[PDB]
Amino acid sequence: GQRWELALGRFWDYLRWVQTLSEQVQEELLSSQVTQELRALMDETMKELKAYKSELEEQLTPVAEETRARLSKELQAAQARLGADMEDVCGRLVQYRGEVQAMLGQSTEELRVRLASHLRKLRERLLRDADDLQKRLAVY
Per DSSP (E only), the strands in the chain are none
The 10 Å CB-count burial string (b at 16+, else e) for 77-91 is ebbebbeebbeebbe
Shortest CA distance to 26 belongs to which of 76, 90, 104, 93? 93
What is the spatial distance between Cα 81 and Cα 104, in angstroms, rounded to a whole number?
A: 36
Tell me the CB-side half-sphere exposure of residue 60, using CA atoms within 13 A. 18
Resolution of the determined structure in angstroms stands at: 2.0
Q: Tell me, letter by letter, the H, E, C secondary structure of 69-87.
A: HHHHHHHHHHHHHHHHHHH
What is the spatial distance between Cα 137 and Cα 111, in angstroms, rounded to a whole number?
A: 38
Looking at domain 1-140, its CATH class is mainly alpha
